[PDB]
Structure formats: structure tokens, C-alpha cells
Amino acid sequence: VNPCCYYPCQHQGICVRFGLDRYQCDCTRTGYSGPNCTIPEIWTWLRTTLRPSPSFIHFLLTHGRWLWDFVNATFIRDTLMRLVLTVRSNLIPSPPTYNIAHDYISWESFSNVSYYTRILPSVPRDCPTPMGTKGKKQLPDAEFLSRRFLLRRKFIPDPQGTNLMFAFFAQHFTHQFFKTSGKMGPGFTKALGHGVDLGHIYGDNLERQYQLRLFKDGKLKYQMLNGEVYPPSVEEAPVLMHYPRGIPPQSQMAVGQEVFGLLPGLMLYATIWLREHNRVCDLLKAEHPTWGDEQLFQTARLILIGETIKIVIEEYVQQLSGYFLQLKFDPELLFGAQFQYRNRIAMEFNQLYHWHPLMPDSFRVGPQDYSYEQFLFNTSMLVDYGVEALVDAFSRQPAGRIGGGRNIDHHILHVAVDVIKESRVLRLQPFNEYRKRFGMKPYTSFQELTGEKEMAAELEELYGDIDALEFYPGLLLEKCHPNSIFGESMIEMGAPFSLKGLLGNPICSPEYWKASTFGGEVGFNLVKTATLKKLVCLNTKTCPYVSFHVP
Ligand code: HEM
Ligand SMILES: *[C@@H]1O[C@H](CO)[C@@H](O[C@@H]2O[C@H](CO)[C@@H](O)[C@H](O)[C@H]2NC(C)=O)[C@H](O)[C@H]1NC(C)=O
Ligand SMILES: *[C@@H]1O[C@H](CO)[C@@H](O)[C@H](O)[C@H]1NC(C)=O
Ligand SMILES: *[C@@H]1O[C@H](CO)[C@@H](O)[C@H](O)[C@H]1NC(C)=O
Ligand SMILES: CC(=O)ONC(=O)c1ccccc1O
């Protein structure tokens, strides 16, 4: 039998088949040696024995308010942020490694970017079981597993007080780089650029961008309604949008991300950013009167990418982490370090980001409470209430807890189901194996996994062996910290993926991080000082309560 099915190689060592039945682990640069890369090197042993547990670190980061307040105001802040930035990233490989077609390095894997990459090779198609060596011959019925462990029974709010403003941001944001090609199958992505390219505002292809663009003052096309500014209609911006048959082009808003029409929350953020883009153009023009359309546009896009990356690090991630340490966005922190300014979206990263539990039972907008069947495709609510109106409403309603289990609304539970199904087609490796990839002890029992005995008990009869527990279910059912939005694994695995994909951008490089790049000091500060509040209020008549945290 395929020896690599036993996943013999520890610590990032590579399992290669040799002869008819042998195998060898390439322990190059893994820090360990031996047949399976288990014998540590002197420095490696020290490092691994002198590293406080993930939970301990988390502890230190979420306590000592008085302490941090003092640290955050010194240089230690920067020092730690850099540590975080670097340490966390070195986990994600770059240049990227494998994809759904190759479980080994290949020039194509590195060239063909329609491919999502993956951190761990697939479970060899010829292993005794679906997960490799352990578990039953057939995995739990996807749907059952979902109804039994992910379906929300009673709404469980996120203890960290995260709101829908955050939720919808997360959705809007991720959908600029998570765009699975329906025409190519799983593992493929129409979101080339694999990162924060703001393709969800400008489009994933030129023609579409060109269509979305006004080609005057560098501005982006738009339309006026009730005296306010909203994205143009599909009749004026003949772009392709995914709306249900029966809705005329004059009722569809063209934005950059085809799917964004299927939720006011999305189209909301779409409007906000469009608004901003246009505004930045104005700013740039006052400064550079000799500039043409292209450059005004091109520059304005770089500024928004900067802003986006800023707001995500200092307010969005901050929100999630709940850290007392003040996260900081400063491309310079890495100028001394060894870092590759490029990113390649991983399928595992895609899985992990399905945060559907955030969605509420219903959507409250003031005295009015809207249902899914009232929200999901409402092509007027946005224009009816207005940007400010919604931002105030979404900032006040709490999002649901992500980790914990049984907290996904039925209206959208069908997704978590496909996520599991897709996982198997992608032949993702076992949860534990991924745990190790991200420097964590594998779980020994389902009862160590979940914080309890009853659910674990059932998961055990179903999966057979904790070592068969799949990637997504593991992330979503794993026990949660004291009162955090999710578990250890979610943080330990996701943080690397998110920090790398944030700093691994060309504008974060020393070659790009110049003021000239953003049209001078004016444009540069726009980035250096961007904030969720400003992003909203500097583009709306009134200023509502805006924040990722419910008041
Ligand atoms: C009312 C709210 C929401 C609805 C109706 C919804 C619906 C969907 C649907 C239908 C898919 C496609 C999968 C399929 O064809 O079965 C999807 C994918 C996804 N959703 Fe949600 N979603 C919602 C909220 C969210 C939120 C809050 C997040 C968190 C950031 C999120 C993240 C994702 C991700 C990452 C994907 C994968 C996209 C891809 O692979 O291209 N969704 N969602
Ligand atoms: C990236 O890889 C995919 C799959 O390896 C390529 O698509 C396949 O192309 C071959 C020959 O053109 C066809 O026989 C298949 O039908 C295609 N399959 C899919 C999934 O579309 C794709 O051409 C590659 N992209 C580039 C530009 O290199
Ligand atoms: C290497 O791993 C294989 C499979 O798990 C095992 O049979 C073998 O005993 C291991 N060798 C060492 C020295 O750990
Ligand atoms: C859309 O929302 C408005 C209020 O924003 C409501 O009056 C109307 O009934 C909704 N239409 C739908 C989708 O049922
Ligand atoms: C210190 C650090 O990396 O924080 N990151 C996160 O909390 C984080 C962000 C996005 C997704 C999952 C996460 O766990």
C-alpha cells in the first residue's frame, strides 16, 4: 500500500515514493533529520522547548490591559507586530507549492494561476480509506453531519460583540479573492491576482473594468437616486451580473463582483467603496491637474488597496483577535526581514473562511425586522434606506458566534453542506494533519477536540477515529476559547493565511511603498490613516454609528 498514506514525514518533510514500495522523506531545511524528520537539531530543540503554548500566548495577549496600554505606546509595539507579521507568515509557502492537479512542485503549478494552491498534498487516491489510513470505509453523510452539528437551533451571539457591519465586510472583502470557477470545477479560481487587488470593485478582467469605468476624471461610472450616489445600472454599465431571471437591466447594479447583487449588505459596501474611489480621484486631480484619466484611475486604485489593507489589519483583524496589543500596518516593519511580496490563495484558506454562522436569524433595520426572503435579493432596500441608514443598522445588530457548533441559520446551512462535500472532492487531508502543519499537537480524542462529552461521543461513532475528523468540521466544532468568536485552530491556521495575503502585496514592498506611488503625501496619508469610520462618513451626508463592534 501507498506508504505516504500513513503520512510518515513530520515537520514539513516531503513524502516521496521510491522503488516499488519504498518511500523517503526529504527533510531538507525542516530543522529535523532521520527517516521521518523527527530527530531535532540542537537549536530546533531549544526553540520547541522554549515556546509557550498557543493558549498561553493568547492569554498574555488578552490580559494586562494596563500593561499593554504602556507597551502599545512604545517601540515594543512595532517590535512585536513585526514578530507577529514574520513568525506567522513563514508557515505559508512562497513560491507556492501544490494544487488540485499536482501533489508535488511543478512549473505549471507555479504558472497556471487559475489553480488554487494548497498547503498539504491530497490524500493519495489509492489509500485504504478516504482520509488515508484511518476511519471507516465511507465518511459521514455530509448533510446529516451538518444537520446534526452545524445547524443553528437557538441563535448564539458572538461573545466578542462583532456586528453585521463586520460580517458583511468580511464577506464583501473575501469575495474579491475567493471566486471558485463554476465552469472549471473545484480548485479553480476566476479570481486571478490571488489577493487584495480590489477586483471586487474594479473587476477580475479588463473588459469588465473598462465597462465599469467612466473614463473621465479617472472616476468610476455611477448613478444618482434620491439625490444620492449609487453604482450605475447594468443598462449603463453593460457588465455581467448574477441576478435572478425576471429582473430588467435597469434594475441591476453593475459593480465589479457579479454576485454582489444578492444581498443589500454587499451592494452597500460596493457603494461605499465606489463613492470613495471617486472622491480620491477628485483629491488627486486638485493635486495633479496635468494628469489624465488612466493615471488618475490607476493611482486612485492603489490608494484604495492601501486603505483596504490598512483598515483590515488595524480594525478588522484587531476586532477578531480581541488582542490587547495594538496591531499595526507598516510595510516597513518587514524591510529588514526576508519576505516575498506575492500571494497565492489556498483552497484550505477558502474552506476556513466560510463564516456563515455570523449571519443572523433575521435582519433588523430600525423598527423593521426583515426576513431572509425579504433580504436576500431585495433590489431596493439599499436605495430605500440609504447608506448611512444601513451602516447604522448593521453596526448595531450582533453577528453570530463562528466557532462552537450548531449556529448556522437553516436558510444558508446548505452551504456548509457543500463545503464538506467539496472538501472530499478536493481530497483534503485530515484535521489533525493540518493541525500539525500549523504547529499544533494533534487531538487525541473527540472529547479533547470538543469541550464536552455528548457531541464528541457521537462524532466518535460517526468518524470512527479522531484522525478521520475532516478539515472544515474540525474548525467549526473545535472547542472555543474562554469566550472568543472561535477556536485555537481557526486562529493558528487562519492568521498565517491572512497576514501573508495582506503583506504579500506589491504595494507593501520597498519598491512600491513610496509616496510618489500614491501621487504624493496627500494620497499616501490617505492610506496611512484610513479608518472604517472615515471610509463611511467621508462619503455620506450624515455620520451614523459605524464600527465592527456593536455598541
Ligand atoms: C445571508 C448571507 C450569506 C449567504 C446567503 C451566502 C451564500 C453563499 C453561497 C450560496 C455560496 C456558494 C456555494 C454554493 O454554491 O453552494 C457562498 C460561498 C461563500 N461564502 Fe457565503 N453567504 C453568506 C454570508 C457569508 C459570510 C458572512 C461570509 C464570511 C466572510 C461568507 C463567506 C463565503 C465564502 C468564503 C464562500 C466561498 C466562495 C467561493 O469559493 O468562491 N458568506 N456563500
Ligand atoms: C490551467 O490548467 C487548466 C487545467 O489543467 C487548463 O484547462 C484545461 O485545458 C485543456 C487544454 O487546453 C483542456 O483539455 C481542458 O478541458 C481544460 N480544463 C479546464 C479545467 O478548463 C487551462 O487551460 C490552464 N490555464 C492556462 C492558461 O494555462
Ligand atoms: C517512520 O514512520 C513509519 C510510518 O509511520 C514507521 O513505520 C516507522 O517506524 C517510523 N520510523 C521512525 C524511526 O520513527
Ligand atoms: C424590500 O425591502 C423593503 C424595505 O427596504 C420592503 O418594504 C419590501 O417589502 C422588500 N421587498 C421584498 C424583497 O420583499
Ligand atoms: C495575531 C494574528 O495573527 O491574529 N489573526 C487572527 O486572529 C485571524 C485573522 C483572520 C482569520 C483568522 C484569524 O485567527
XYZ file of C-alpha atoms and ligand atoms in Angstrom:
664
model
C 0.000 0.000 0.000
C 0.988 3.617 -0.607
C 3.405 4.331 2.269
C 2.691 8.049 2.147
C -0.889 7.314 3.203
C 0.483 6.859 6.684
C 1.762 10.413 6.419
C 5.165 9.366 7.710
C 7.034 12.672 7.245
C 6.762 15.032 10.213
C 7.658 18.721 10.358
C 7.060 19.770 6.770
C 9.253 16.974 5.425
C 8.203 15.747 1.970
C 6.957 12.194 1.298
C 8.243 10.777 -1.983
C 7.535 7.322 -3.365
C 10.593 5.279 -4.368
C 11.126 1.900 -5.933
C 8.020 -0.270 -5.998
C 7.144 0.014 -2.291
C 9.683 2.254 -0.527
C 9.400 5.936 0.410
C 11.837 8.619 1.580
C 11.282 11.859 3.456
C 13.074 14.938 2.166
C 13.823 16.651 5.467
C 15.664 19.475 3.777
C 15.511 22.591 5.938
C 12.773 21.183 8.196
C 15.025 21.528 11.204
C 14.849 17.786 11.891
C 16.515 14.687 10.491
C 16.111 10.925 10.448
C 13.825 8.651 8.359
C 10.702 10.689 9.121
C 12.288 14.028 10.145
C 11.737 13.552 13.883
C 15.241 13.997 15.252
C 15.590 17.714 16.069
C 18.742 19.751 15.627
C 20.227 21.497 18.640
C 18.696 24.950 18.019
C 15.408 23.405 16.964
C 15.079 21.501 20.218
C 15.658 24.711 22.168
C 13.136 26.671 20.160
C 10.470 23.992 20.557
C 11.045 23.656 24.313
C 11.130 27.413 24.890
C 7.850 28.208 23.156
C 4.843 28.914 25.381
C 1.661 27.135 24.244
C -0.623 28.861 21.721
C -3.169 29.190 24.526
C -0.636 30.782 26.878
C 0.435 33.380 24.307
C -3.254 34.119 23.706
C -3.575 34.582 27.429
C -0.792 37.155 27.625
C -2.297 38.995 24.664
C -5.755 39.244 26.215
C -4.829 40.397 29.707
C -2.813 43.106 31.409
C -4.717 45.975 29.836
C -2.747 48.460 31.941
C 0.422 46.748 30.736
C -0.291 46.721 27.007
C -1.513 50.308 27.075
C 2.053 51.144 28.066
C 3.631 48.819 25.502
C 1.396 49.935 22.658
C 2.720 53.454 23.156
C 6.391 52.475 22.835
C 8.532 50.755 20.196
C 7.886 47.323 21.663
C 4.588 47.630 19.825
C 6.366 47.688 16.482
C 8.834 45.023 17.602
C 6.051 42.622 18.492
C 3.975 43.417 15.393
C 6.994 42.534 13.291
C 7.462 39.346 15.229
C 3.819 38.527 14.606
C 3.973 39.549 10.953
C 7.060 37.428 10.246
C 6.662 34.410 12.505
C 3.037 33.940 11.413
C 3.830 34.141 7.714
C 6.765 31.714 7.486
C 4.153 28.962 7.666
C 2.598 29.715 4.291
C 4.943 28.589 1.486
C 6.015 31.057 -1.229
C 6.640 30.466 -4.127
C 3.563 28.273 -3.775
C 3.703 24.501 -3.819
C 0.880 22.181 -4.920
C -2.573 22.347 -6.449
C -5.560 20.134 -7.236
C -3.630 18.687 -10.168
C -0.167 18.188 -8.698
C 0.791 16.866 -5.296
C 4.407 17.833 -5.980
C 6.102 21.010 -7.211
C 5.658 21.675 -10.906
C 6.310 24.572 -13.193
C 2.630 24.564 -14.114
C 1.510 24.766 -10.509
C 3.660 27.860 -10.302
C 2.441 29.291 -13.622
C -1.226 28.414 -14.072
C -2.953 30.756 -11.642
C -6.461 29.542 -12.405
C -5.455 26.967 -9.814
C -5.930 27.386 -6.067
C -2.813 26.194 -4.267
C -2.923 24.007 -1.190
C -0.659 23.696 1.848
C -0.906 19.939 2.093
C -0.877 17.415 -0.773
C -4.051 15.479 -1.319
C -4.862 12.193 0.353
C -3.397 9.734 -2.174
C -6.235 8.434 -4.375
C -5.066 4.893 -3.633
C -5.163 4.743 0.165
C -7.103 2.143 2.180
C -9.506 4.853 3.335
C -10.811 8.284 2.223
C -8.667 10.011 4.837
C -5.656 7.820 4.242
C -5.289 5.018 6.726
C -7.836 5.586 9.439
C -11.594 5.946 9.748
C -14.441 3.950 8.242
C -14.582 2.994 4.548
C -17.168 5.718 3.967
C -17.331 9.174 5.579
C -20.393 10.610 7.396
C -23.276 11.783 5.236
C -22.392 15.426 4.568
C -25.943 16.649 5.097
C -26.507 14.647 8.300
C -23.236 15.890 9.767
C -24.496 19.358 9.013
C -27.991 18.999 10.492
C -26.558 17.179 13.471
C -23.691 19.540 14.297
C -23.834 22.837 12.437
C -27.499 23.744 12.085
C -28.362 26.629 14.383
C -31.073 25.702 16.851
C -31.042 28.826 19.016
C -29.171 31.951 17.919
C -25.813 32.159 19.736
C -24.378 35.701 19.543
C -20.656 36.285 19.174
C -19.331 36.995 22.683
C -16.807 39.453 21.277
C -19.730 41.637 20.170
C -18.993 41.524 16.463
C -21.777 43.069 14.337
C -23.191 42.581 10.855
C -21.150 45.583 9.692
C -18.141 43.370 10.329
C -19.813 40.257 8.915
C -20.754 41.861 5.612
C -17.303 43.428 5.396
C -15.721 40.010 5.788
C -17.995 38.634 3.079
C -17.507 41.553 0.683
C -13.717 41.566 1.250
C -13.023 37.831 0.913
C -15.118 37.594 -2.213
C -12.527 39.612 -4.078
C -10.132 36.699 -3.816
C -12.431 33.744 -3.186
C -14.132 33.149 -6.543
C -14.376 29.491 -7.405
C -14.897 28.872 -11.122
C -18.149 27.042 -11.662
C -17.043 26.156 -15.186
C -13.713 24.574 -14.199
C -14.613 22.605 -11.090
C -13.183 22.800 -7.560
C -9.665 24.055 -7.021
C -10.039 26.634 -9.775
C -10.488 30.373 -9.320
C -11.728 33.152 -11.545
C -10.047 35.458 -9.045
C -6.585 35.556 -10.551
C -4.481 38.038 -8.658
C -4.993 35.842 -5.623
C -5.186 38.654 -3.104
C -6.172 42.196 -2.302
C -6.346 43.606 -5.809
C -9.782 45.068 -5.168
C -11.035 43.096 -8.102
C -14.457 43.107 -6.466
C -14.669 46.848 -7.127
C -12.799 47.103 -10.438
C -13.484 43.659 -11.904
C -11.472 40.491 -12.436
C -10.769 41.296 -16.081
C -10.009 44.383 -18.159
C -13.060 44.473 -20.406
C -15.251 44.486 -17.307
C -13.097 47.170 -15.667
C -13.316 49.244 -18.791
C -17.066 48.826 -18.720
C -17.273 49.838 -15.044
C -15.126 52.914 -15.733
C -16.315 56.368 -16.711
C -13.084 57.333 -18.484
C -13.297 60.903 -17.258
C -11.576 62.468 -14.247
C -10.419 58.901 -13.553
C -13.783 58.338 -11.919
C -15.815 55.162 -11.937
C -19.331 55.135 -13.515
C -22.336 55.707 -11.251
C -25.913 56.920 -10.951
C -27.966 59.367 -8.906
C -31.022 58.256 -6.931
C -32.874 60.266 -4.305
C -30.073 62.790 -4.611
C -27.548 60.143 -3.620
C -24.774 58.338 -5.494
C -25.082 54.666 -6.313
C -23.320 52.273 -8.695
C -24.542 52.576 -12.309
C -27.206 50.287 -13.759
C -26.430 47.318 -15.996
C -28.016 49.306 -18.805
C -25.363 51.998 -18.431
C -22.602 49.611 -17.404
C -23.402 46.540 -19.606
C -21.420 44.218 -17.417
C -22.459 40.675 -16.470
C -24.221 40.401 -13.065
C -25.763 37.324 -11.416
C -29.398 38.313 -10.816
C -32.449 36.047 -10.991
C -34.265 35.931 -14.329
C -37.066 38.476 -14.414
C -35.145 41.483 -13.243
C -34.532 44.036 -16.048
C -31.038 45.524 -16.613
C -32.339 48.902 -15.475
C -32.912 47.300 -12.084
C -29.473 45.733 -11.783
C -26.402 47.489 -10.376
C -23.054 46.807 -12.079
C -20.267 46.727 -9.517
C -17.283 44.520 -10.190
C -18.288 41.373 -8.358
C -21.107 39.552 -10.216
C -22.520 38.016 -7.051
C -22.764 41.229 -5.009
C -26.317 41.874 -6.171
C -27.600 39.055 -3.990
C -27.617 40.981 -0.692
C -28.095 44.603 0.308
C -25.202 44.277 2.735
C -22.818 43.579 -0.132
C -24.122 46.181 -2.554
C -23.874 48.503 0.435
C -20.083 48.151 0.765
C -19.890 48.178 -3.001
C -21.442 51.654 -2.940
C -19.240 52.896 -0.131
C -16.012 51.985 -1.913
C -17.205 53.290 -5.300
C -18.034 56.504 -3.505
C -14.530 56.633 -2.030
C -12.774 55.843 -5.303
C -14.485 58.782 -6.999
C -13.649 61.060 -4.059
C -9.948 60.115 -4.111
C -9.936 60.974 -7.840
C -11.158 64.443 -7.022
C -8.409 64.776 -4.448
C -5.750 63.579 -6.862
C -6.930 65.937 -9.608
C -6.729 69.002 -7.393
C -3.125 67.967 -6.778
C -2.231 66.790 -10.306
C -4.096 68.923 -12.885
C -1.934 67.670 -15.746
C -2.849 64.028 -15.107
C -5.047 62.061 -17.461
C -7.836 59.537 -16.927
C -5.714 56.392 -16.714
C -3.251 57.670 -14.146
C -5.931 59.262 -12.009
C -7.784 55.952 -12.083
C -4.700 53.758 -11.718
C -3.457 55.855 -8.803
C -6.807 56.002 -7.064
C -6.874 52.198 -7.184
C -3.515 51.885 -5.478
C -4.685 54.207 -2.705
C -7.813 52.131 -2.046
C -5.778 48.910 -1.986
C -3.586 50.591 0.619
C -6.609 51.801 2.617
C -8.242 48.376 2.434
C -5.101 46.639 3.673
C -4.895 49.217 6.456
C -8.452 49.004 7.701
C -8.236 45.228 7.689
C -5.098 44.989 9.857
C -5.835 47.680 12.439
C -9.620 47.454 12.803
C -10.936 44.241 11.218
C -8.299 41.742 12.391
C -7.959 43.710 15.615
C -11.680 43.135 16.091
C -11.357 39.392 15.618
C -8.198 38.850 17.677
C -9.613 40.731 20.619
C -5.939 41.344 21.363
C -4.858 43.993 23.837
C -1.840 44.557 21.635
C -2.397 47.297 19.067
C -1.909 45.633 15.655
C -0.138 47.882 13.192
C 0.035 48.278 9.424
C 3.522 49.331 8.366
C 5.112 47.696 5.300
C 8.409 48.993 6.647
C 8.446 46.560 9.545
C 9.445 43.937 7.006
C 12.056 45.872 5.060
C 14.723 44.328 7.218
C 13.257 40.818 7.066
C 13.282 38.252 4.276
C 9.797 38.283 2.745
C 8.282 37.570 -0.653
C 5.864 40.202 -1.827
C 3.456 37.812 -3.570
C 0.492 35.606 -2.502
C -1.438 32.620 -3.913
C -4.871 31.787 -2.482
C -5.047 28.349 -0.896
C -8.083 26.078 -1.104
C -7.751 25.369 2.609
C -7.856 29.116 3.199
C -11.073 29.220 1.194
C -12.682 26.438 3.268
C -11.726 28.014 6.587
C -13.257 31.367 5.637
C -16.793 30.073 5.217
C -18.005 32.079 8.231
C -21.716 31.677 7.577
C -22.524 31.339 11.273
C -22.152 35.122 11.518
C -25.410 35.645 9.665
C -28.405 36.396 11.946
C -31.862 34.857 12.225
C -33.314 37.934 10.566
C -32.171 41.438 9.606
C -33.185 44.399 11.760
C -33.192 47.860 10.218
C -34.581 50.175 12.884
C -38.141 49.320 13.976
C -38.413 46.999 10.948
C -37.205 43.400 11.019
C -36.596 41.806 7.591
C -36.563 38.085 6.818
C -34.213 36.216 4.508
C -36.959 36.044 1.906
C -37.155 39.807 2.314
C -33.420 40.449 2.422
C -31.603 38.056 0.090
C -32.496 39.689 -3.210
C -34.135 42.962 -2.240
C -33.245 45.299 -5.099
C -34.430 48.445 -3.325
C -33.756 48.282 0.416
C -30.324 49.834 -0.156
C -31.654 52.770 -2.127
C -34.739 52.972 0.109
C -32.986 53.387 3.459
C -29.690 54.859 2.283
C -26.030 54.089 3.044
C -25.864 55.783 6.451
C -29.153 54.187 7.497
C -27.899 50.661 6.849
C -24.416 51.132 8.244
C -26.061 52.276 11.480
C -28.334 49.239 11.480
C -25.674 46.692 10.620
C -23.264 48.176 13.161
C -25.868 47.714 15.879
C -27.008 44.139 15.208
C -24.728 41.417 16.590
C -23.298 38.718 14.342
C -23.373 35.119 15.454
C -20.551 33.173 17.056
C -18.457 31.384 14.441
C -16.939 28.546 16.408
C -18.885 26.394 18.837
C -21.191 24.409 16.565
C -24.926 24.336 15.844
C -25.002 28.034 14.950
C -25.623 28.241 11.191
C -29.046 29.514 10.071
C -31.080 26.977 8.083
C -31.599 29.441 5.263
C -27.925 29.017 4.405
C -26.980 25.703 6.017
C -26.951 24.173 2.536
C -23.593 25.853 2.054
C -21.729 24.243 4.942
C -23.011 21.016 3.412
C -21.419 21.607 0.032
C -18.248 22.850 1.732
C -17.897 19.416 3.286
C -18.734 17.661 0.031
C -16.264 19.797 -1.918
C -13.643 19.047 0.736
C -13.814 15.384 -0.234
C -13.597 16.020 -3.972
C -10.538 18.109 -3.190
C -9.300 15.166 -1.113
C -8.233 17.452 1.742
C -6.134 15.754 4.425
C -7.328 15.003 7.995
C -7.929 17.789 10.510
C -5.110 16.728 12.802
C -2.580 16.585 9.965
C -3.405 20.230 9.281
C -3.123 20.884 12.999
C 0.482 19.733 12.829
C 1.164 21.745 9.686
C 0.340 24.832 11.670
C 2.451 23.809 14.652
C -0.087 22.173 16.961
C -0.402 18.859 18.767
C -2.902 16.607 17.060
C -6.032 15.908 19.090
C -6.042 12.546 20.822
C -9.811 12.286 21.234
C -13.028 13.893 20.125
C -13.531 14.791 23.758
C -10.263 16.745 23.709
C -11.485 18.363 20.490
C -14.927 19.472 21.618
C -15.059 20.858 25.126
C -17.630 18.227 26.067
C -18.657 14.565 26.121
C -22.002 14.190 24.336
C -21.294 15.665 20.897
C -17.803 14.168 20.895
C -19.361 10.813 21.724
C -21.486 10.990 18.585
C -18.710 12.317 16.413
C -16.705 9.309 17.509
C -19.254 6.697 16.434
C -19.593 8.569 13.156
C -15.977 9.244 12.234
C -14.535 6.216 13.949
C -11.212 7.869 14.725
C -10.350 11.466 15.595
C -7.693 11.089 12.908
C -10.501 10.916 10.360
C -12.146 14.150 11.501
C -12.225 16.404 8.410
C -10.811 19.922 7.976
C -13.974 22.029 7.957
C -15.947 20.160 10.630
C -12.874 20.293 12.837
C -12.552 24.051 12.528
C -16.251 24.606 13.272
C -16.767 22.128 16.111
C -13.466 22.588 17.951
C -13.938 23.967 21.486
C -13.715 27.713 21.808
C -11.514 29.870 23.967
C -12.985 31.360 27.173
C -15.440 33.466 25.199
C -13.888 34.079 21.790
C -15.554 34.107 18.396
C -13.810 30.831 17.553
C -11.175 28.227 18.375
C -7.442 27.742 18.526
C -7.167 26.060 15.151
C -9.189 28.806 13.480
C -6.672 31.358 14.706
C -3.475 29.357 14.417
C -4.251 28.228 10.859
C -6.071 31.300 9.591
C -3.772 34.014 10.904
C -0.820 32.869 8.713
C -3.077 32.721 5.692
C -4.459 36.183 6.383
C -1.318 38.032 7.381
C 0.677 36.673 4.432
C -2.084 37.534 1.991
C -2.079 41.035 3.415
C 1.621 41.853 3.495
C 2.385 39.744 0.434
C 1.265 42.562 -1.848
C 3.494 44.539 -4.217
C 2.447 47.853 -2.683
C 3.808 46.594 0.645
C 7.237 46.195 -0.914
C 10.040 48.750 -0.584
C 9.855 49.360 -4.327
C 6.219 50.406 -4.124
C 5.790 51.788 -0.624
C 6.799 55.293 -1.726
C 4.763 58.464 -1.626
C 5.212 59.028 -5.357
C 3.352 55.738 -5.783
C 0.195 57.255 -4.330
C 0.547 60.642 -6.014
C 2.400 62.330 -3.188
C 1.893 62.899 0.519
C -1.861 63.556 0.209
C -2.545 60.178 -1.337
C -0.010 58.425 0.877
C -1.541 59.623 4.147
C -4.970 58.607 2.850
C -3.578 55.097 3.157
C -1.514 55.660 6.290
C -4.563 56.988 8.133
C -7.544 55.144 6.631
C -10.275 54.059 9.014
C -13.666 52.311 8.820
C -15.344 55.463 10.107
C -13.733 57.800 7.566
C -14.397 55.271 4.795
C -18.086 55.716 5.560
C -18.639 59.195 6.951
C -16.467 60.993 4.404
C -18.831 59.627 1.757
C -22.237 60.108 3.391
C -24.397 63.151 4.165
C -24.776 62.329 7.839
C -22.486 60.217 10.024
C -24.051 57.156 11.688
C -22.716 54.791 14.298
C -20.006 52.942 12.369
C -17.872 50.083 13.747
C -17.080 46.350 13.602
C -18.117 46.165 17.269
C -21.734 46.515 18.357
C -22.258 49.461 20.742
C -27.068 35.952 4.005
C -25.651 35.610 3.941
C -24.962 34.745 3.082
C -25.421 33.962 2.047
C -26.846 33.778 1.509
C -24.244 33.266 1.487
C -24.308 32.367 0.413
C -23.220 31.726 -0.177
C -23.315 30.822 -1.303
C -24.591 30.426 -1.996
C -22.109 30.407 -1.638
C -21.815 29.459 -2.788
C -21.641 27.960 -2.518
C -22.656 27.050 -3.241
O -22.875 27.208 -4.482
O -23.242 26.167 -2.566
C -21.235 31.084 -0.666
C -19.887 30.955 -0.644
C -19.043 31.572 0.271
N -19.446 32.381 1.309
Fe -21.255 32.842 1.831
N -23.078 33.591 2.147
C -23.488 34.491 3.130
C -22.622 35.075 4.050
C -21.244 34.863 4.095
C -20.338 35.472 5.107
C -20.734 36.414 6.259
C -19.066 35.041 4.837
C -17.908 35.379 5.568
C -16.756 36.128 5.100
C -19.211 34.171 3.648
C -18.139 33.548 3.034
C -18.237 32.741 1.929
C -17.077 32.169 1.294
C -15.619 32.347 1.697
C -17.581 31.447 0.256
C -16.793 30.645 -0.767
C -16.739 31.436 -2.086
C -16.007 30.769 -3.235
O -15.486 29.635 -3.097
O -15.959 31.393 -4.306
N -20.540 34.058 3.200
N -21.933 31.886 0.222
C -4.699 25.841 -16.374
O -4.941 24.441 -16.198
C -6.222 24.008 -16.687
C -6.321 22.552 -16.323
O -5.023 21.981 -16.262
C -6.306 24.228 -18.201
O -7.601 23.816 -18.691
C -7.690 22.642 -19.425
O -7.078 22.864 -20.696
C -7.047 21.677 -21.518
C -6.322 22.065 -22.788
O -6.456 23.457 -23.044
C -8.471 21.178 -21.818
O -8.416 19.898 -22.447
C -9.309 21.068 -20.544
O -10.671 20.922 -20.915
C -9.162 22.293 -19.630
N -9.788 22.023 -18.348
C -10.315 23.016 -17.634
C -10.469 22.784 -16.140
O -10.669 24.088 -18.132
C -6.091 25.717 -18.503
O -6.020 25.911 -19.911
C -4.801 26.226 -17.854
N -4.726 27.667 -17.971
C -3.680 28.233 -18.566
C -3.958 29.492 -19.366
O -2.529 27.780 -18.503
C 8.633 6.322 10.289
O 7.229 6.280 10.012
C 6.762 4.956 9.668
C 5.285 5.088 9.387
O 4.645 5.839 10.408
C 7.020 3.969 10.820
O 6.667 2.649 10.416
C 8.487 3.999 11.246
O 8.650 3.217 12.423
C 8.937 5.442 11.510
N 10.354 5.470 11.809
C 10.799 6.162 12.853
C 12.267 5.994 13.211
O 10.079 6.910 13.520
C -37.595 45.133 0.214
O -37.339 45.946 1.353
C -38.325 46.972 1.528
C -37.779 47.886 2.587
O -36.395 48.107 2.368
C -39.682 46.343 1.855
O -40.685 47.345 2.049
C -40.060 45.428 0.689
O -41.251 44.729 1.017
C -38.932 44.418 0.393
N -39.235 43.658 -0.802
C -39.075 42.340 -0.797
C -37.767 41.785 -1.334
O -39.929 41.571 -0.366
C -2.319 37.614 15.713
C -2.992 37.127 14.464
O -2.463 36.607 13.529
O -4.391 37.361 14.532
N -5.094 36.901 13.365
C -6.356 36.456 13.587
O -6.844 36.465 14.741
C -7.156 35.931 12.423
C -7.483 36.713 11.270
C -8.252 36.123 10.215
C -8.692 34.794 10.285
C -8.382 34.019 11.402
C -7.618 34.585 12.467
O -7.347 33.769 13.542
